Amino acid sequence: PPSGYGVLLATHDDDTVDVFTSGRKMRLTCSPNIDAASLKKGQTVRLNEALTVVEAGTFEAVGEISTLREILADGHRALVVGHADEERVVWLADPLIPRKLRPGDSLLVDTKAGYAFERIPKAEVEDLVLE
Amino acid sequence: PPSGYGVLLATHDDDTVDVFTSGRKMRLTCSPNIDAASLKKGQTVRLNEALTVVEAGTFEAVGEISTLREILADGHRALVVGHADEERVVWLADPLIPRKLRPGDSLLVDTKAGYAFERIPKAEVEDLVLE
What we know:
Structural class of chain A: mainly beta
Distance between the termini of chain A: 52 Å
Organism of A, B: Mycobacterium tuberculosis (strain ATCC 25618 / H37Rv)
Largest sheet of chain A: 5 strands, antiparallel
Order of helices and strands of chain A: EEEEEEEEEEH
Strand content of chain A: 35-45%
Keywords: AAA motor, ATPAse, mycobacterium, proteasome activator, 20S CP, cytosolic protein
Oligomer: part of a larger assembly
Shape of chain A: elongated
Number of helices of chain A: 1
PDB class: cytosolic protein
Largest interface: A-B, 25 and 22 residues
Entry title: Substrate-engaged mycobacterial Proteasome-associated ATPase in complex with open-gate 20S CP - composite map (state A)
Chains A, B: Proteasome-associated ATPase
């Protein structure tokens, strides 16, 4: 009955996936119940004691928030700046790739996993330019 | 089958290579399928529960952006500083030994592994100059 959680990283042609869990990256096989094609990068995946992906839910809603600096030319990574001016090159999740992200946008990230899940609207920038 | 990952440090003629994983370095033998000479410095390897190097690859993930200060005499190690003015020497990877390196170039590094993997293009330029 007890089942853990992990962060999906990428998909492989061997019907295998990379899962970040307990601060470590592991190679896992999707269960026959789920379809490996429907999986998306950065999506939370439910694991088990046998280390098998059995269900994928939505994306994480809590964690750190960082300021976006730039989007790399490859289109799958973004350079952002942490709270103490620490700079990280983090993967972009599927929802991030409205308008395309611009420098200065705030992204919800978890540094250990290294993914940007959601653009978080800021009230200060909205208040600066009155409408 | 579940499996983990590690970072390759060096290769020896004894068909044994040094791999950093789980926060520690171990000298392990490679599988017969893979070729020892084919492996390069600074690239990832895939381990197993028996710790057998079965698959190769390259490292492309997050990392604290480090400012390169200078290149040492031997030409295989580089001095980099971090956000907290922490100076440390790191082994250069194969793809960095490309344009000639210069002081102040941003680099992608793994502090636990001590390897610089790639040079991140400057954010202050690309996000603005392009049109």
